[PDB]
């Protein structure tokens, strides 16, 4: 059958993510945040969430060090995120989605736009002159209601896979999600994590909703 | 002389010998075989076969048409003789012959993916007509069986990479006034407008001052009842539908195929446009 992992990415700091390499204006914001083209909502790409979550979970399940190609991670990490070896191809169970901004209306109640322009520079240490930059971050405290599908191929491995899913979610809470992360941004948190089956009824869904509910 | 005009909503694939390539017209082999595949679902295969065999329904192959103009392939006249490269000529101006493009061709790259082995890419050569453009099939003495066999064929498609998904058209059987008297009138050299093959009793007089171009017609039979195996049918070498002649003939409905559960037919009758040269 098919499962659905749905929750909320709430930002604790700015989280600049995505971008365009296009020449932004003379006075401008440079490297804007990635957006949905239609709604002009700020966006979390599903690729960015998958790549960062896979990297942290691959580093932790190794353990500690991780210095290989993405194709030959641990077999747990292959069986969640996928693999493209020559004879050991492993299909991805998880399927991430592009994540639009969830609480735009609540951010409108405070009468703030959903994104901010952060002012930054660097000081050239030989010459002590400043190199100003503007970057477009999402504002903090904004939510992102996601939805991750999970293939269910083996019934004896779903508890271990959802343990690793919750572990990747917990490890991502102590890192950033994109952009200038170590310079004070990118910090996210996961809220209201739960599992709902797509169609049908599951006999062992209480323990998955209990692993992901705590 | 009615006109089976075909407007296309989809890119089409009319294969010649390979899937990667496609021509812009379907031959009358394809049209007759398509119509009779539509007939066997109706339980009216023999009525259509005897309707064609008694020369009552007789159609050409597909020719291109643009807005108000009807084109035909270049008649390879045996002349004693830029304008050198014109693959299609109008049917209105042929007597005085003694600028043009419809859509474009493409190659739609595809795969057969698998989970645990690597995918197998392949190409399907398409052809997209313009929005004011399509193909037409000449027909003499239209028939209500023919009028309804086109009504089923527009919901099953014509061409090659049908069913997925390329043949889709919407016909209009139309009647014209300046190109029925191009067939009523006559000259002295008879050009061919169908994938014809003269019978063995008249081939040696069919080719006397002929200037032809043989085109091989083969391929696999398309039925789930013919000996329960996709098996090739014996190749038939017919004249091109842009060849000329001095002595007219009449082709045949050749049954190309050995042992099997139904006769696999191939339309090799002729359809001449007599002109003076």
């Amino acid at each position: 059958m098919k499962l659905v992992i749905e929750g909320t990415i709430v930002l604790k700091t700015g989280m600049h993510i995505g971008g365009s390499s296009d020449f932004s204006a003379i006075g401008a914001v440079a490297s804007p945040v990635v957006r949905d083209t239609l709604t002009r909502l700020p966006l979390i790409p599903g690729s960015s969430l998958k790549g960062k979550m896979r990297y942290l979970l691959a580093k932790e399940l190794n353990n500690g060090i991780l210095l290989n190609e993405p194709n030959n991670d641990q077999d747990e990490i292959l069986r969640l995120f996928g693999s493209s070896e020559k004879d050991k191809i492993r299909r991805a169970r998880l399927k991430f989605n592009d994540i639009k901004l969830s609480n735009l209306a609540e951010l409108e109640t405070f009468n703030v736009s959903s994104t901010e322009v952060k002012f930054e520079n660097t000081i050239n240490r030989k010459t002590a002159v400043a190199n100003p930059r503007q970057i477009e971050r999402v504002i903090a405290g904004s939510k992102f209601d996601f939805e991750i599908f999970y293939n269910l191929d083996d019934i004896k491995e779903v508890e271990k896979d959802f343990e690793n899913i919750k572990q990747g979610f917990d490890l991502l809470e102590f890192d950033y999600l994109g952009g200038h992360g170590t310079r004070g941004s990118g910090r996210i948190a996961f809220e209201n994590l739960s599992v709902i089956t797509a169609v049908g009824n599951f006999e062992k869904i209480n323990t998955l909703n209990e692993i992901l509910g705590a | 002389m009615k006109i089976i005009k075909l407007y296309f909503e989809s890119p089409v694939h009319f294969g010649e010998k390979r899937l990667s390539e496609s021509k812009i017209t379907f031959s009358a082999d394809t049209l007759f075989s398509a119509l009779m595949i539509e007939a066997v679902g109706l339980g009216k295969e023999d009525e259509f076969y005897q309707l064609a065999s008694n020369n009552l329904v007789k159609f050409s192959d597909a020719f291109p048409f643009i807005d108000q103009y009807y084109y035909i392939p270049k008649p390879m006249f045996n002349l004693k003789l830029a304008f050198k490269k014109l693959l299609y000529v109008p049917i209105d101006s042929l007597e005085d012959y003694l600028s043009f493009n419809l859509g474009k061709l493409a190659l739609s790259e595809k795969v057969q993916q698998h989970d645990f082995k690597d995918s197998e890419p392949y190409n399907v050569g398409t052809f997209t007509f313009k929005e004011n453009t399509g193909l037409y099939v000449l027909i003499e003495q239209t028939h209500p069986l023919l009028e309804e066999l086109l009504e089923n064929l527009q919901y099953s498609g014509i061409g090659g990479k049908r069913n997925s998904g390329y043949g889709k058209f919407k016909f209009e059987i139309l009647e014209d006034s300046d190109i029925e008297d191009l067939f009523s009138a006559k000259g002295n050299r008879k050009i061919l407008l169908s994938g014809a093959l003269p019978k063995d009793a008249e081939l040696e007089q069919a080719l006397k001052n002929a200037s032809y171009l043989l085109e091989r017609r083969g391929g696999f039979v398309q039925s789930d009842t013919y000996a329960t195996n996709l098996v090739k049918k014996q190749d038939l070498y017919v004249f091109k539908s842009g060849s000329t002649f001095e002595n007219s003939f009449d082709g045949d409905i050749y049954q190309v195929g050995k042992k099997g559960n139904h006769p696999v037919y191939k339309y090799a009758k002729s359809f001449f446009l007599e002109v003076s040269v």
């Binding site: 204006a25 003379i26 006075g27 401008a28 914001v29 804007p32 957006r35 002009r40 736009s113 994104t115 322009v117 477009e136 | -």
Partner: protein, 139 residues
Amino acid sequence: TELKIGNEKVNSTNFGDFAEKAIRGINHKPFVNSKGGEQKITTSKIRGILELVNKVYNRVINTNDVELSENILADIAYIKVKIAYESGREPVVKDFIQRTAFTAAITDVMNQRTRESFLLFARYVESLIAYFKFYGGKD
């Protein structure tokens, strides 16, 4: 989509030409200051004007709506009164706002309240900073 400058309308095809023409109007005949000498506007004041219109440009481009919001037009009229304030401060700014007709263009976008008008005015100002740095600058 036009923008009346004095009486010569600029569209999205011939605004950078008139920005460069206005820079060569200001250059080659600069502002005599009644002290006797000739002065030109500093780079910090002109980049202040550029960031003044860019505080709205950061909020205009990320919206699809062809009709401007009431908050955006509020800041455009606020840009107009602020430019009128700086023009009253030093006349070197006043000659710049006169010859590169900033107030007349900002009135025109204040009248025809459409997103394309502000985008054209912003590209006009940005091209004007560009030709200020290129032609006759210290760099």
